[PDB]
Amino acid sequence: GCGELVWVGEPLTLRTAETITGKYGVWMRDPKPTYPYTQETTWRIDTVGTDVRQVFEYDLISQFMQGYPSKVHILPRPLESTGAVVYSGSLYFQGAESRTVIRYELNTKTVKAEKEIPGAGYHGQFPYSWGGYTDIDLAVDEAGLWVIYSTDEAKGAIVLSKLNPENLELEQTWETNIRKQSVANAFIICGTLYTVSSYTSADATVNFAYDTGTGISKTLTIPFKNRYKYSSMIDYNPLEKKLFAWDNLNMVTYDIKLS
Ligand SMILES: [Ca+2]
Ligand code: NA
């Protein structure tokens, strides 16, 4: 069931990158898996550098945690930053040095859709507080695919839009009052956007919420620990009902509780 976020557990480390290429990155699973993948399939992208194209795919959680990839994809266009997601068989990622979101179908290794996010800042205009060109952050929740960004019209406040996952059309858009560059990252649970206060602190918080169903903004004080002091990626997986994050070489997960 759905509800308001009221608690975040301790970070559990599932895998640690062994080279600087993985200081920051994104790892994820598909909340709507489709053949030939399952809910165990895991994708990992080490995102340090300027020509990021390698996506590590693991059929089994055991492989993700202890072994080599079962397949490596080479994306047809380099990828920007840590905001990508996998949803219903496709990797949704941002093209390097662009405001373009690309739908890359994993089974066929084929680009199925591309869309400029209208007005979105990119490449260091509205990053989260750590930088990293994190201007555009994709999200999956219980209702499907979203994108988190900002625009000049919004004066850098977080904007979020629901996306058509087939053709990337924007279906609805909400504007918050939260300065995107003032928070460490964000994610969406049950239609509510949440932000994290700090990417370095062991004593950070989930500090703001914006409910797209009611339009109401709130402050929160839910503890959030950056165990390794440099969180580059914090997303929510609605199938596992957990946070997935990347913290200074470490792929970590957090349990949650909803009201
Ligand atoms: Ca995020
Ligand atoms: Na994301």
Residue numbers in the entry: 244 to 502
Verbatim from the authors:
Illustrative of this latter group is E352K, a variant documented in gnomAD as appearing predominantly in the African or African American population. Similarly, the finding that E352K does not exhibit characteristics of misfolding is consistent with the later age of diagnosis of glaucoma for patients with the E352K variant and a lack of clear Mendelian inheritance pattern.
Inherited missense mutations in the myocilin (MYOC) gene, within its olfactomedin (OLF) domain, constitute the strongest genetic link to primary open-angle glaucoma via a toxic gain of function, and thus MYOC is an attractive precision-medicine target. Myocilin has no known function, and there is no glaucoma phenotype in Myoc knockout mice or in individuals with a homozygous N-terminal truncation mutation or hemizygous deletion of MYOC, but rare non-synonymous coding mutations lead to toxic intracellular sequestration of misfolded myocilin.
